[PDB]
Design a protein around this ligand. Structure first.
Ligand code: A1EFY
Ligand code: A1EFY
Ligand code: A1EFY
Ligand code: A1EFY
Ligand code: A1EFY
Ligand code: ZN
Ligand code: ZN
Ligand code: ZN
Ligand code: ZN
Ligand code: ZN
Ligand code: ZN
Lengths: 323, 323, 323, 323, 323, 323
């Protein structure tokens, strides 16, 4: 053990001037994310399925064309389900694997298992194809600046498999891929040759995106040790609207209202939270109206709400890394 | 498993025109329940006592008289208590036992054990005698409609024994009939012959009443995955207000105030929720003034409030079931 | 509790003069069991298969034909397997169901699941078809005596489903019917009406047969608190030797060699022993040569050895029960 | 068992009148607490450390100077931790240990471990040095009236050690002293000689103080089985204001506000609540802004808020003990 | 932590010359142990009973007349049983409580709960009134030498309450008093002010006596880390017979045969063994023939076998302490 | 699943003839093992220590020099312990990692921690430095024949770290490296791409070596599901004797004796056995006399016994792999 694992407790942003912001809002394109990153993911992709194989190649192919030095890992594993043993694969994308600290962004890339009702197919556009597509567009839009990284801190993406339950949500029939990965990281020394610190120690903060893409969302501030970065979010939303860099957005319908909760949700942050990781959980209260219906689909997304959030997220990340 | 367990997530009411609502308002009577269903329950009936056996006979012989083909089971079992071993009996009443799905209403029929204090005896008017009687009046007013049932969905009622702690509320000393019954349904194939599904799968939704009977209640919405049905309950209160069918009512004091909660309450629903069954928990917050005191008696109930909620619950059930 | 649960510790045989022993030696026949009770069981009968259902019908219709008032129950339930959910059925046969105490004989009626290897199919002649048939011949030879029963003690038989592991022997994948049934009796009052005692209390002693059918077995004494009854079994072998009633026998190769063991074997008795019930475990050590191989077939059984042990077990039971 | 464990259910306060209230409000001194109880506790005081030992001395000394006949016990124990095995010591201070019923005030007296960041030290002013000094000041201010104790009910204080986690919060890295002490009282008979009642049964109400000192706190009503006593704190606050005995205080921003909370906090009360003890939990929501930073120091505390809260707590305690 | 807790691993006896032995064999009187120490203990003494109270006073009164500086403690506690919560009391007798290391001798002083069959009463003469009486006679016979203790080592006796089960032997209905005391000692620092070592560390070896008093007993050598002192036992038995200091004792019926086991027994050593304490378990294989019968009584003890063992035990203890 | 996990059930050896046996018996050298594999491992080598690191280097180096194409992996992980958190490293050495089936030889390469007593150091000669050198010598002696591997079945070696307990043996203070590695293989799919089979499924037989080196060992047959392979070791021993290829060896005192054992030993095999892997456990009963003392050193080892056992093990391994 040493002292660097407490650095995250004292870390401060580098906020951007109003000329800089302008640039960022101009650096991202909702319509190319729609075409190149999202539409290929709107397919039946439950664990084990052919579409699961397909979504996984798409993701790596998109990261591989970028210019920054990304390092991809495929973490494959076996577990028991209500239908038997099945195989699962998490996807992990890391700049600077050697660095001690990383900021982490994540979502889940599987879609719930369903029968073909009404000759229809479930594809989970908010749940969570869009958040996947948001993580990809961000890495494209900031690619040039991200090269800069050749504070011992950098960035990592995680796309989890097996979040949804197969049959009945339970402590054993849900969260396959994140219950797996959190335990593996708690048992891996980090950095190499370390005697007392694991890879979980290295996670500054986990920002988890889920159920995004519907008009008029409202996000709670969930956690006391993440409260100060939720506030940074509120402020970024505000200066942007004050310069009219957002569309179809009123200050009385803000996304980031400072209002609490208490009654937590089960999601891929629970394995890591139970082990002490600070979490910023970007999920709305309440859930889109189509949650887990065949109508959670492409024609029910609001182009504008998605577009506004890409801008807020991209700013936060740059601010956190001092880029 | 199979495909039918899904249907409950696609399920939608068949809502009532306002004419219908009129018929049903006048089709139940508060004065007949009060004396034929409730007064027989206002007695000492902790598990094992002679009140327990009497209460049990009364419940079953009221159900057995109606025209609909109700099928009764008694589920008797033994558990360890802080006073040593004792005997417990749950009550289950089912229409179309063989149908694959059932909407379920339920409450607890025991009363908590106290010593006689100043020659007063604890009867639990609110906790939960009124929920029992409300359930019994329901099966009467709708007997004619329910009879039709001969979408493979039907109705079921549960009266749990042993909700209350014998000495100190704890995991080991509370919720005796519910913990037992939830593990029993978990292990029982359903429907007969099945090879991969259980009776708990067949539970479309669980409505639990508890601590109903005092005036001015406020009912939080507790759980997201049941929230569409909590909304319905709000519609029903509203309109019936407009149609002048409630009494001593003020939209100031509406029972269903959408606001979110938690939560966070320990009750008979726990062992079922744990295993993946949707729940609709109708217990007020705050509790009544007289909770677990000797004044929880008959003279402290507001006749107008129960009359009102019998109307709301009766409608919900036809609407959920399409009659 | 009460006082009757003690009686089993004070209980003593009523031993048989040698005349009696003669009558009983000639009162059973090995050739009638072999063809009327055994051959119908030599088939593939892993849980869920069609063999399982057939085996089950055969067992019940053999019992149902005899003069003694046997009462049959089928105990059907659902469990999680490494192949997903499946259906299981235990068989229980009881004389004087209401008597407070019962001596219990038992074995497992399923066969282990294998793939067809060189067009051979696994039938488990020793494991445990012969124990089933031995149990069935018993209830025949003594039908006349058992009839007398109308000391509140009587007899019961159990045939467990699901003893064998589906894929890899482990706590979660083995002993499915026994784990389920032991928890069920643990929770059921006995006798009816009781307030402090259970069906497991009523279990005077549990005799489990398994892996019987090859020649030269050796039966360790496993448990102290059943050792007085293991001794009785040694008397019975000895004398019957002296009286020239066994066959192809050598006191060199006596089956019951007093020496101590452990132990240490996982089998259907575990969930019952765990909760305080005396056990008499008649499984050989070492196992047969052909254990879990395809040669565990009919042609490898020694007719003389089973004839011998049917004699020993039949006597024990009259002696334990006083007929 | 006996009947006395029911008394706490029916117990009622003896409300003070207006002449009394001004007496109490003038009887406490904020500057004496500040300089003589509080400043000595603003030191590094994590478990095992010299500051831990100084603090313990300080709390013991100050109680020893008082007239009332407090019985002091140090409850020292041993426990595994993420840094290996360690010794902890709870502080217990009892009037009339023989009395069967006690009202309990509690807090935690350790401070969280941190490395020194840029020459700063964590001293946990709100967390929970202020709560410690409020308990010492109330003992001084009420001393003469406490003498009256010699309704068999007295008062008791607990300073817990090891509340905080060494590395990352979990069930086995936190609440060291309160897990230990709860489980011991549960296994200790009270009053002496009893055969079926424990010391936990004699806890009338556990009032835990935590995270106190910042301006504008708001306290939720956490628990339905203490709600009537929360109500008493609101009435107390309101009448003290109306008499003009509070400083810098607005009825629009009051401390005890009748709003509930769904999703609770882990704290020293869990182990006693899990075993059925009634809790009044005096921790605010939201947490102070300075929570778990080096800025939770002396200069960020609000004098007037703490003096107001002292006066309310003192009144509450006298009315409980009919003094 | 330090180094003295490993001393027990290197500790060697001080063996006695053949003049010394003679003395010891002359120093003990079976007939006064029979009259003064044993006969008062042959009474109904189940937990809670009047005879439990009586046996407990007898024991302390006997220790209090001796001349060495014994320190008595009564450890009273509460636990749940099949019949409810009951109170229990262990008895502890210690020379030199401050010393770091102690040799420990123990047995249980409760007798099993039974109905009065045949107007008869169970008193457990082997189980374990005799071993109690043996521990007392030893302290009398060596009293003078024991004073010598005013290596930091000395001696301690423990008489456990609640060994037997009330209703059905189980992990929760057996071993009350030793499951309790072992956990308490693991959590107590020893010696005072210690940071890393508990009272369990201080136990060199626990010698546990149970079921003694019947002719022709045979004791296994159970444990590899106690094997070397079991051998000392064998040797003491041998030299004594070679000098004819024993009665009715043949070298072909020795008590201490070097022969193994493996299949452990459940008894009061399990709580301490599971936590690493070295155990020498003086229980025979097999159990007396009267085990748990009304015939386990005074007229079935063999005066001579008991007398021989007092001599072997007394020698071992003196040899271990170098006295 | 697939069918191959059944192969190990039907697999049969290819017995060597007499010309072959003399070749093997002459092909191994005890003096080369002694000076080049064994003496370097007689050092303090507890986890975390410099000797731990030297040992690891030594084992890796020696395998690296050999022709066959061993694939080496260091499996380093992190784990809580009685002295805090720590880093451990297992050593794994595989031929043909792709093959689906492997035969596994194993031992532990750490030494127990002790303080120095009178200038002596614990080096664990039998426990388990000798077993480590036997595994290195067999690799040398069979190298040329192992080349033949390129029936899809190869060979694998495991040196476990952290077998021993730091303070006192328990489920959470022992078997650090083998708990870790079992659970990982169970969650890893094999062969690559599989959807329902793990690496554990490919363990044909795990042969664990422990506590080897003393004169006159006797090994029990511990496990019925490996008994046919134990039988092969007896036949091997017997024919090697008859050919006069063993040294100082009597058929009256032979190593593999057909006697069973009831009550097993906790060792590195438990975690694989608990998940259904077949085990041949080569540990003797009784344990060596020098067990866990400073006398388990070089001078107390028996050369001829170890050379005999090498020859038997080498034969056994070739016959498994039809080499
Ligand atoms: C009762 O069964 C449950 C159902 C839902 C929850 S839950 O807490 O609301 N889980 C939501 C997480 C999620 C779903 N799709 C994407 N993310 C929890 C339990
Ligand atoms: C401290 O022990 C506890 C006591 C109460 C709760 S509780 O959450 O408030 N549940 C009470 C449910 C109930 C009582 N009577 C009818 N329904 C929780 C814990
Ligand atoms: C490694 O997995 C294990 C396999 C077997 C045992 S076992 O103890 O040998 N039990 C087998 C019982 C049985 C098998 N067929 C009929 N009865 C124990 C563990
Ligand atoms: C099956 O129920 C059981 C019965 C006995 C055992 S046991 O292992 O044999 N316990 C013996 C301990 C004892 C009894 N009286 C004095 N000491 C274990 C379990
Ligand atoms: C407390 O003392 C104990 C004695 C024996 C056992 S044990 O069960 O026999 N297993 C330890 C085996 C071993 C030790 N070193 C190498 N192998 C465990 C604990
Ligand atoms: Zn979802
Ligand atoms: Zn209640
Ligand atoms: Zn089998
Ligand atoms: Zn804190
Ligand atoms: Zn006993
Ligand atoms: Zn060892």
């Amino acid at each position: 053990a040493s002292a660097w694992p407490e650095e995250k407790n004292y870390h401060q942003p580098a906020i951007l001037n109003s000329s800089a912001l302008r640039q960022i809002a101009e650096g991202t394109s909702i319509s190319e994310m729609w075409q190149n990153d999202l539409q290929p993911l709107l397919i039946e992709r439950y664990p084990g399925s052919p579409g699961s194989y397909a979504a996984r190649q798409h993701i790596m192919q998109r990261i591989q064309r970028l210019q920054a030095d990304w390092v991809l890992e495929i973490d494959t594993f076996l577990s028991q389900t209500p239908y038997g043993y099945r195989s699962f694969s998490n996807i992990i994308s890391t700049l600077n694997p050697t660095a001690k600290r990383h900021l982490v962004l994540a979502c889940h890339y599987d879609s719930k298992y369903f029968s073909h009702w009404n000759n229809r197919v479930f594809v989970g556009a908010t749940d969570s194809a869009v958040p996947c597509a948001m993580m990809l567009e961000l890495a494209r839009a900031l690619d040039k600046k991200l090269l800069s990284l050749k504070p011992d801190l950098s960035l990592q993406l995680i796309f989890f498999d097996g979040e949804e339950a197969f049959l009945h949500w339970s402590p054993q029939d849900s969260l396959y891929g994140s219950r797996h990965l959190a335990a593996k990281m708690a048992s891996t020394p980090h950095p190499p040759g370390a005697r007392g610190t694991s890879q979980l120690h290295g996670m500054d903060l986990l920002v988890l995106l889920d159920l995004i893409g519907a008009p008029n969302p409202t996000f709670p501030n969930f956690f006391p040790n993440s409260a100060r970065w939720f506030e940074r979010l509120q402020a970024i939303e505000h200066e942007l609207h004050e310069l009219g860099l957002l569309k179809d957005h009123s200050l009385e319908g803000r996304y980031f209202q400072n209002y609490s909760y208490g009654g937590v949700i089960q999601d891929d942050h629970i394995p890591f939270l139970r082990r002490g990781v600070p979490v910023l959980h970007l999920i709305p209260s309440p859930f889109p109206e189509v949650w887990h219906t065949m109508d959670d689909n492409e024609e029910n997304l609001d182009e504008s709400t998605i577009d506004n959030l890409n801008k807020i997220l991209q700013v936060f990340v740059l601010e956190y890394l001092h880029l």
